[PDB]
Amino acid sequence: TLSILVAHDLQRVIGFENQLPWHLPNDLKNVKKLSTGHTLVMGRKTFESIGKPLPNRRNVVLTSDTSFNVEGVDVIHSIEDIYQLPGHVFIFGGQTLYEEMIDKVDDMYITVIEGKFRGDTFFPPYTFEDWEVASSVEGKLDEKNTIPHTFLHLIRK
Ligand SMILES: NC(=O)C1=CN([C@@H]2O[C@H](COP(=O)(O)OP(=O)(O)OC[C@H]3O[C@@H](n4cnc5c(N)ncnc54)[C@H](OP(=O)(O)O)[C@@H]3O)[C@@H](O)[C@H]2O)C=CC1
Ligand SMILES: CCc1nc(N)nc(N)c1C#CCc1cc(OC)ccc1OC
Numbered sequence: 585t586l587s588i589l590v591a592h593d594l595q596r597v598i599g600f601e602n603q604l605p606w607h608l609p610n611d612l613k614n615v616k617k618l619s620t621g622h623t624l625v626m627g628r629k630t631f632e633s634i635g636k637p638l639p640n641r642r643n644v645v646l647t648s649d650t651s652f653n654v655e656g657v658d659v660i661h662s663i664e665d666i667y668q669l670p671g672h673v674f675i676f677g678g679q680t681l682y683e684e685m686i687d688k689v690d691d692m693y694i695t696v697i698e699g700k701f702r703g704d705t706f707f708p709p710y711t712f713e714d715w716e717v718a719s720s721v722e723g724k725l726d727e728k729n730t731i732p733h734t735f736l737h738l739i740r741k
Contacts, residue, residue: 598703719736723735
């Protein structure tokens with residue numbers, strides 16, 4: 585399976601200044617559970633802002649950097665190398681990845697952040713007429729999770 589995993593806001597903001605604009609541990613928990621024991625594919629900037637691979641799953645970084653050789657990370661230099669990755673593969677971002685991959689994925693796991701944030705990076709426009717809602721679960725608003733959010737699993741129609 586080839587999936588997208590993204591958190592985006594009402595205006596499809598995904599990032600600001602190489603960081604996430606909001607702080608939503610529920611969504612981190614959702615990522616962890618969904619991708620633990622599987623593969624995350626991310627662009628180099630996303631990797632460099634995380635700072636280290638996420639534990640208990642294969643971390644794959646896409647970069648044109650021929651000197652890239654990070655401990656605990658696998659590197660690919662071409663989009664086409666994604667299709668050779670075995671198992672359940674999640675396109676983990678950021679913007680360039682989502683743009684290159686939106687038309688190829690089976691499937692998208694989207695956390696809709698029900699707010700409008702200052703952003704400099706975006707999820708591409710998509711229509712609910714190409715995508716069927718397999719599940720829509722309202723996130724629990726919280727002490728520690730203070731923005732309304734909805735977990736979507738969408739499957740290509
Ligand atoms: N809300 C969310 O779910 C997520 C948010 N983000 C956010 O997104 C932002 C980063 O997004 P963005 O700036 O687009 O960057 P990316 O993380 O997508 O990284 C861009 C880099 O990835 C590499 N790359 C992409 N495509 C190719 C290709 N076809 N061949 C070779 N290398 C390639 C290049 O690295 P190189 O220059 O080394 O060649 C490129 O410059 C940050 O703000 C981050 O916080 C990221 C993921 C999820
Ligand atoms: C955890 C944020 C997130 N949620 C969903 N649903 N999908 C995603 N692809 C992401 C992401 C991301 C990149 C990222 C994660 C992070 O937490 C460990 C810290 C920084 C990040 O990039 C700046």
